[PDB]
Symmetry: D2
Subunit: 391 residues, 4 copies
């Protein structure tokens, strides 16, 4: 079962040396006892033999093994944060003249990497609506190399029909590299590589760390794409420190029991918001009526705790402050995936500015919630007090 | 004095909160108390206000302040390792169609970044001999954007005439971006920005960490180049974890005493090797007669502990094993800059293969030594026993 | 609610400085800006002003505040492990000529502290059956200074009738110091200081850390006993490092969701064992019929995951190996409270040796289980295969 | 040589697993693969086999091995701080009816442990002047069990004549346990166990950590005393966390270079103070004419950087603030042994209160300096500016 796998993934004696968790091996230099040992380590420097800290130590190898098991991959590359994983995973597969197709709901830094870094290197990015499904085939060009998915989408939470997208891509361009930012599912609520996606990228910063106190990115690739990902990310010097790798492995051990609580509480909040007179729309993948909810129910094994809703009006600046400055339990901060509940607001034009070649279909202020581990009735009371401040 | 500055750099109450060292603030999310505080943080997100962990926490800000003071820069960008600092600093300043001019003695991963990553992104790379001095003017092309120095050079230790190179570049291409990998000097034995170099890059993994147990890159830029470095590195998701930042700041505090011992011991070893009947050549910047020694004496305030020498013969494979497998104090490992002494060997053709457009001028086996903090007479005895195994 | 309190306890801006979690302030030396500041710190050196690392840094103060809130105490002393907390908390309240009255089910190291350390310092120790209730009055001597409870008991899991014990102690010896080892409840499933117990001691090593990778003891005292505990423990140099304090605070944030899973899974396992033909007895506080279950039901707000059962025979060493060496999911290790399930065996004569002045009422091998976060059906299948190896 | 030993002590493959430094193995639970392995671990639970985190992990074993090598001991017990090491090492060897004879220059918390904890447990304490030498024999009682040395003394820096003290103790009470707080020498500038002392105690917090950011105590015993120290300290739950153990091992690797700088700089400052018109007395073991200097010269292999001096007046409150509040390089803080220079003031009556059965022989304000790694001419200028503020 998944909970059993999460408890045990990566925890073998060669890494733990007798403790429950892997040892933390901090190193740049790794010592070779003989020339023959150095030769063996060199041949196997990307295959789990100690060679140099930039390739990893036992602590990294343990996390990589866990991530490959849990996401069903051939290899797991590590990065200093999620944004580095996105940027370097895309970069690993493109060259001057290539085209990238990206969902218009991609995380904003991912879009900005494409428009501000890739563009000046001669790589063009085109965009698609997250519900395009099989019609994505019409957007694939002879030079399309990468198709970049993010399901649910950032902020607005739309869920792709991954089977339809993948089948369409494979009909026209079977060698294309299909990638997904699978952070919301923590890589485990949506088994991306089983759907024919080539690489599943996560900001392990979110639910894998689970406590808002480490940053790390991961990218798990299938056998076809692993060597290129591994070696090109390594040429960019991408790695994570051993201690953060240890904390990510450690986060896996409570991920199941945390996600179940985030799911239960966030769906309860979403159902309540959906009945609320001051709410126009709720964007939660698990809530009926949300964009792509059908595909969430069919293709995912659960939900996490991040979602958004649209208020019945556009808050003025004074109302925004009255609303946001006076919560007792929800905090304003970027990121998500921890034990604390968070809140942020965006006006519709702010979202339109990060929906390339598209418009938004709402006019109220959008509120993004991360539902943490607090008692849900306490969180509901905090939201109700917020509504009373703007009614 | 430098020792006083090393002890005190970056250690102000806003970061230390009453301890001697900065606090370790581990964070992705950073909490805004009000909308107005969030707006202030956003405006100052690259100016030392807490905004998001990818930009940094107090711990990173303290290290950045220290590095800017010590290297005389306007800002310091942080990276997961030295190789990431090199790759991402170069990438931050190029676009397709540009040309990079790099010393042929650059660290091999730096060269491989150019030939295997930059080339396919439309950026070409040419090469120069490290002693080219003023004649580098003749290699500057209409599209040359970056000139990349490394002094002393990797492995073979040639010291550039930086004043001559910089003046020649500035004559032809006043606005070119001149960068140096200043790891051997730990950024402090050679004050690169004072020579008109724009960006000083280090593998802080080496002497700044000082103990072979953390990896981190830094790049300190002048005011002209800082914004582009900062923002382009950020778009690639480049950062370091808070704990490694803390350990780098901590390493600064003993860097002076350590470097003085590495200098004293390595020069004594180099002087002894230069007299030895089994040694053809010694490549140590501080040793009279070594390539660019004149420029080391004029432009540096000291030496570190890394150097190389050439044996009086080409060792066979059996002799290589007899030599390297049987040291008692020197260990075989990559990297350097720690408290432990290290040894590695290369045959001439191995070096030729990483000297683009050039040949090597020696035929014996080259031995690279890192001289650590052990008693120097014990290290000399270990080297003497090695010579007896191959005589 | 408890979940909201656990998420938020100890997190105030003075400690977090903008992050979700408290900063990690590592220090011996704490720097006074002026003589005036040093005088204020000295006066308040046990009252939350920074004075010296042995008293604590911001990180410790944050944890102490959280523990005092959650357990309803006046102060929380910190120790290097649970055993240090037990030994030093008892030591803090005794002098030569005193008597300690301790439950015969106390953790063996607690008993050994009493019989091997206290005895030679002129402090005697007597014993009581954990179900003695109101009859403890007859065991209280004129020199009885400390009454030491542990509910549930170690290994055999008997639950005290705390109201009856406390009322009897206060009738006969109102000034006595009543202490409890409250580790099984994690200090939160049994609110000891609301029952008139003076000091609640925990091995935070167990459920508070929650991941088997830190060691730390805590003792939360009421107002009457705090000053003596604090100052006498400080005279023994008792403290914990800042990083383990941080990790204990961090563990609080998932404690609720973890404990609910440990309760659900362990009670299901206990119910299955209680109908199993190879099981003579099940010792689980939450299982109807277990010793002191009625007091658990009345006085606790939930259960954790540690319990035991007695087999239908005393296993030989060959049978123990066949049983224990071949589990797939349960591991053999000491301690408990983590995400992993653990198994250990005790022969009845081993238990008798640590039940002073009492006898054991079973003859089969006792198996102690820690039920972790794995899927319960997987754990049940592992236990079933174990039974088949010994049937 | 000592530098080579310090670099290499404790660093064997079974602890480093290929890195330069020991792995960091964080654990309470240590997992036994079989019943056979559990039995072997139990038999060897105090002899370097993994058994339970309270006994230690690989990281602790590596530190213990290093400390035993460097101090020439049979075993090394670890503690949460130096004060815990002192208190628990004394406690490990006493029982009701015993007497402790302690130098009246002992660190004040050591004295207070004896007078506030031991006294109420039936253990008495008497005192001796640090220069008593052979005349200590007259103070030894039939029940004297422990003789406790500290050389140099706390604050006032008097060096004992250890050969004369030890010979006198052995002539009258050969079975006594002779202990020393050897923190000032970092355990390596005075090889206590070679002088017939039984146990060498250190606050590893000071020079071994070396950076003012960890707390840890050590006690290295000879073969006669090791088992009692080890087992009685374990019964009090004394241990240190794995990460601080790692950082102590790491501190050893620069201890030699650091101590040489602290010696050179502090002696220069002491010589300057000794000719200064505002200075009445200088207490520095390495300065000719200081109390016990002849014993330091004979018995020590170097000096550290902590010493004191007496001003030519007793500063008023206004003068104390003018002097201490306005230093640019010296910080006011407790503890010492780091890279930062520190300053503290004590009035004569403060010292008199912690010199039991002795009298102070100065009337000016006493200033204790820790001389760090800053440039010594900068430190001298800071002291000179201080003198100008109180002239
Ligand atoms: C979907 C998604 N991908 C990537 C990231 C970036 O991760 P990091 O902040 O670790 O760089 C985030 C940030 O919030 C995210 O939400
Ligand atoms: C000169 C130089 N630059 C960069 C590096 C790369 O540093 P890192 O190993 O931290 O990526 C090294 C590696 O040995 C180096 O010697
Ligand atoms: C009930 C109880 N108290 C105290 C302890 C001791 O805690 P530590 O191992 O952290 O010293 C334990 C050990 O398993 C325990 O179970
Ligand atoms: C000589 C001496 N021993 C012991 C200690 C106590 O060490 P710790 O602060 O680690 O408890 C100190 C404190 O300054 C000390 O100077
Ligand atoms: Cl194709
Ligand atoms: Cl130009
Ligand atoms: Mg190896
Ligand atoms: Mg909150
Ligand atoms: Mg060595
Ligand atoms: Mg398991
Ligand atoms: Mg006054
Ligand atoms: Mg200072």
């Amino acid at each position: 079962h998944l909970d059993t796998a999460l408890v045990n993934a990566g925890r073998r004696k060669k890494y733990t040396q007798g403790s429950v968790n892997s040892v933390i091996q901090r190193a740049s230099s790794l010592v070779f006892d003989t020339v023959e040992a150095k030769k063996h380590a060199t041949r196997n420097r990307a295959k789990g033999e100690l060679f140099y800290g930039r390739r990893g130590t036992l602590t990294h190898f343990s996390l990589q093994e866990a991530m490959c098991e849990l996401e069903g991959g051939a290899g797991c590359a590590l990065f200093p944060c999620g944004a580095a994983a996105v940027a370097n995973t895309i970069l690993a597969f493109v060259e001057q003249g290539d085209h990238v197709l990206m969902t218009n709901t991609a995380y904003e830094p991912s879009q900005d990497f494409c428009t501000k870094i890739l563009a000046k290197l001669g790589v063009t990015t085109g965009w698609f609506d997250p519900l395009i499904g099989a019609d994505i085939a019409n957007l694939i060009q002879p030079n399309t190399k990468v198709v970049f998915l993010e399901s649910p989408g950032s902020i607005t939470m739309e869920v792709h029909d991954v089977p339809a997208i993948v089948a369409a891509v494979r009909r026209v361009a079977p060698e294309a590299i299909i990638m997904i930012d699978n952070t919301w599912a923590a890589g485990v609520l949506f088994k991306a590589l089983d759907f024919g996606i080539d690489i599943s990228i996560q900001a392990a910063t979110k639910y894998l760390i689970g406590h808002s106190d480490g940053m790390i990115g991961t990218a798990v690739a299938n056998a076809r794409c692993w060597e290129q990902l591994c070696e090109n990310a390594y040429l960019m010097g991408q790695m994570i420190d051993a201690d953060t790798a240890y904390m990510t492995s450690r986060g896996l051990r409570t991920l199941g029991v945390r996600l179940r609580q985030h799911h239960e509480s966030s769906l309860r909040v979403a159902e309540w918001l959906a009945q609320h007179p001051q709410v126009a729309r709720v964007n939660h993948p698990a809530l009926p009526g949300s964009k792509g909810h059908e595909f969430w129910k069919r293709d995912f094994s659960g939900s996490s705790g991040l979602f958004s809703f649209v208020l019945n009006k556009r808050l003025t600046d004074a109302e925004l402050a009255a609303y946001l400055d006076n919560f007792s339990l929800f905090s304003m901060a970027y990121s998500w995936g921890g034990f604390e509940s968070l809140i942020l607001a965006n006006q519709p034009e702010h979202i339109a500015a990060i929906r390339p070649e598209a418009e938004v279909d709402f006019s109220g202020t959008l509120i993004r919630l991360h539902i943490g581990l607090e008692n849900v009735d306490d969180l509901l009371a905090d939201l109700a007090a917020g509504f009373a401040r703007i009614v």
